């Protein structure tokens, strides 16, 4: 019962510490295996590229005040600290879309009022630190017990759908940069090149299909058990290596490659330094802004709390076989304090990444070798350790000095990898199966508890409601009112507790929503 | 059984006629279904393109004496006649590689000795007619009873392997014609074009994968039974239509398309006419060649007999549920007489086509709708009729006036179709399963009669022997001694009946070989 209220100050935190910290030698010792290396290699590429993409976007939005080097430094430091001191070291911290929305809105507001951007960020971070400390000291992390699987499925489905859409849009942009023309006259990024878009499509699809086939090969009957396990563990590194070698063989055509800034330097050395004075560098900071920086701190707190807590709820479900424990108090305090303190040095804030954390958990899941003939395998265990997170964060930080190796890797391979992650993440969602049940004939539905106890037309209404919520949230995100997306999602918690009982019966809701 | 020796002249022929001809109204009536249209559409493209390819090759080899129009006329006429009067109307007649080898060798010999090519062909055809009549009159089509599944499996495996290899070589030649260059300076088929090779690869792979996925969709669990069964039948027409539309959408890039000669005319109107005088046109034909034309007639007879009889043996196996009967005497007489008479008009000879006939049988197989959960579907029936063969032959003959529609179809779609046919044809061979059993561990082998009654190391020696025979036949075929290919295959019939019993026992041979 980690969500019970004790009535003492900092009670949940000491309970989490006493529950988790004794397992520390076990956490260090469980990492001696071959699956950990494959997980590290997969998640390193899964985590590095969004840093580069969002760093480029942030540098475009904030006129070079924050770029790629700042985001890389923040990701590395926060990831290392969270993995070392966290109660759930299987979570991956990183940047996200709502954070970018908040940063661009705050930059516009600061430029409108003739204020320094980084000083406002400093005071916002300090207010956020105060708010997180006050919330944790009041054991306020028990409200998570009101977050039903309704909102969890909605959140996971929306996030994975957006991930897949963005990957496809990135692929499409190549075809507009490099169109297929009749004549290519002979001649600062290259533009209007021949054989560039089609090769990119081929590389992306090849990587995706090789990874998917190698994943299917694990449950087959060919070869020995050990060879099957080893090949199944290393499917994605093998796909990446094969497609990179294939692309390297063709040396006549232009393809875009990974570019990482060289050296540990601030993006604009003339405009700013690594430390931001809290009282002002060029002008004195007005006290009224220092007082009034609380509202953006409240928005950031709501965003971070929602994302981190929903990710921790999804990751630690009972069907996923998590044993060492879960922390709903220590993780929030760690993330809030580190994010608030990051404002002093002009680094962006971070939160727990959902798809990356789910993929990290999946890459360490060990299934039963004694697969029943013609039956889906069941989860045997999950490897719990702290080495993988520290290694991934260290590699992300160290990528600055390894630009030479990273320069040989095309982006279409990573597009295929991201497609694989997005497609795989949607298979652990019950809404996915309840959506597949729409196509099957009414006599073909399986024996799940939501099938026997509910009529079909009363099971499809729940799915329609969830899909309507997902569509409305996507529409809200796409328009100019995206800054209110974290709030609207939290509005689906009253709906399941005040309105759904008025339509459904308690017995139906017990089986459908569980 | 139809393979017994009655002891009377023409006994087998009258037995075949009396067994098969009473079913004629049922043969005409069984064609009223939707599956027949899909089979016609698939096999029409499967049969038309080899006519064009071999017509081009023959026109190259024979210096324009025989080309594409002659091959099309021969295919149409012989197919219509065989389908109308045959005892096994599920066989498809057409040109093949050994026939091309024979024509090239005979042209070289006629050129060396200063003889007319077409008059020699005329006398060869007459001798072939005489030989076939003499062979059928002595009920000599009973030796087929000595052809064990050893030879049948070897033949089928070799033919399908060669088919797949030729498709891949065609794609490679497409790439070599249009290399990937850095600069494409603007300047008789087009050469050195941009975006042509990669688009061809994409079209081929897309067609193959769409067809394969739609074939898998048949045994699925979604939608109604009627929709599933309609979509499963029309998978290949749907693939072709989708990829043709996709290729038509892109109007910037060059792709090669189907080219069919216009009009019913001889390839070289100056050199020859439609009728070849048997006594000589420009010079008198020496009588010594008229006598000595028997040896090439013997070679052609051996080739046609071997190919047709092995194809009929493979098609009419007991596992395929053939009910209306089989023809081993009428088919040989029909093919031999028509081929021999074709020499008078300067048209090439024909034989039964193995992959095309197997594909034609597969396209008309109906499985049980009551598929057991997690079980292989069972063959319910095969639709026997004569309408499909007549329609396919008529369409092949009529493709001369339909060049406008045919000119909008790229060749990469057909490459994907041929890959699908070749891959599908190798799944009905027991050697394929016995070759897959090498990879599996010895404890996962199935309960087939060749697994329980034979030791594991004793059933791999049989597979190694068969594979060695296949490799030796391929090597012999590729070299300059290819004219001896039909003989060497017939040398595998003594091997099973004279040397194999000296190593294996009666029980092992009975279990391994049917």
Residue numbers in the entry:
A (entry chain A), B (entry chain B): 673 to 859, 884 to 1210
What does the report in the manuscript say about this coordinate set?
Anion exchanger 3 (AE3) is pivotal in regulating intracellular pH across excitable tissues, yet its structural intricacies and functional dynamics remain underexplored compared to other anion exchangers. This study unveils the structural insights into human AE3, including the cryo-electron microscopy structures for AE3 transmembrane domains (TMD) and a chimera combining AE3 N-terminal domain (NTD) with AE2 TMD (hAE3NTD2TMD). Our analyzes reveal a substrate binding site, an NTD-TMD interlock mechanism, and a preference for an outward-facing conformation. Unlike AE2, which has more robust acid-loading capabilities, AE3’s structure, including a less stable inward-facing conformation due to missing key NTD-TMD interactions, contributes to its moderated pH-modulating activity and increased sensitivity to the inhibitor DIDS.
The structure of hAE3 in the presence of HCO3− and HCO3−/DIDS, and without HCO3− supplementation were determined with C2 symmetry, reaching overall resolutions of 2.7 Å, 2.7 Å, and 2.9 Å, respectively. In general, human AE3 adopts a homodimeric state, and each protomer is composed of a transmembrane domain (TMD) and an N-terminal cytoplasmic domain (NTD), the latter remaining unresolved in all three cryo-EM structures. In all three cryo-EM structures, hAE3 TMD consistently adopts an outward-facing conformation, demonstrating a high degree of structural conservation compared to human AE1 and AE2 in their respective outward-facing conformations. In TMDs, the cryo-EM density map was fragmentary for residues 860–883 in the extracellular loop at the dimeric interface and twenty-two residues of the C-terminal loop, and thus left unmodeled. In the AE3 TMD structures, the dimerization of hAE3 is primarily facilitated by hydrophobic interactions between the transmembrane helices TMH6 of the two protomers. Key residues oppositely arranged at the dimeric interface, including L894, I898, F905, and F909, form hydrophobic pairs that contribute significantly to the stability of the dimer. Notably, the contacts between the TMDs of hAE3 protomers are relatively sparse. Attempts to capture AE3 in its inward-facing state, similar to the methods used in resolving the full-length structure of AE227, including varying pHs and anions in cryo-EM sample preparation, did not yield alternative conformations of AE3. The inward-facing state of AE3 is suggested to be relatively unstable and transient, as inferred from the dominance of the outward-facing conformation in EM observations.
